[PDB]
Structure formats: C-alpha cells, structure tokens
Amino acid sequence: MHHHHHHGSGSGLVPRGSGIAQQWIQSKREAIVSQMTEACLNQSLDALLSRDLIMKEDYELISTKPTRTAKVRQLLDTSDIQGEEFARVIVQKLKDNKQMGLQPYPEVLLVSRTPSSNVLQNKTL
C-alpha cells in the first residue's frame, strides 16, 4: 500500500515597524493585489531588478505562480524579507499609474534613491 501528504510553508511575522510603505502594503494588501494587475506587477518587478533589491531566485518563484492575484501577494510577503525599499517601490509603482480605489495613500511618495530617471527600456528576454 501507499499514501501521500501535503504541507503549507506560509509565514509573516514582523517584529517592529520596518517601514511606512512596508506596513501600508499589509493594510491595503487585498486592495493592492485586487488592483495591481499582471501588467503593473511586471513593471514593479523590473523596477526592483534594476536596483538589485529582488533576488532572481524569488523572481522565478513568483513568476511561476498559479495566478496573477497570487503573484502580487507573494511580492508583499517577500518584501518583508528584502527591505523597506522593496515595499516603497510598490506604493510608488501603483501611484505611478493610477489607483484611486487603493486610497487613501500613505504620507510617503519620495523615493530617496538618486537624482536620475527611473528607466529607459523594459527588461530584455
């Protein structure tokens, strides 16, 4: 005779306020995920890529997600592992386009990255 089983590797416990944007994501997580479509998702991803904030290993995992809605969620869960900057990129990305249904927004819009353009050409595959 034979048999099988399964298990869930889910976690998410922050010790203290890592960052405004980071915390905000958790507040409007359901909204950001329900709003941020597959399009905005890819954009936000490539954003951190240029900054070298997201690990390629994580990109693949999220890229090989079952559904788009999950891709966003996982992005927030992983952000806590990366840093405050990671989350800050999201809040800025969403606003970069247009997300009124997500409002109200946090009191942080700046990037504090560097005095220069964001990007010129999307990722190359």
Q: How many CA atoms lie within 13 A of 117 on its CB side?
A: 3
86 and 48 Cβ atoms separated by less than 8 Å: yes
Every domain of the chain and the residues it spans: 20-97
- The amino acid sitting at 76 is L
Long-range contacts of the stretch 53-57 (C-beta < 8 A, 24+): 53/82, 53/83, 53/85, 53/86, 53/89, 54/78, 54/82, 54/86, 55/82
The single residue listed with the structure tokens 């990037």 is: 111
What's the CATH architecture for 20-97?
Answer: Orthogonal Bundle (1.10)
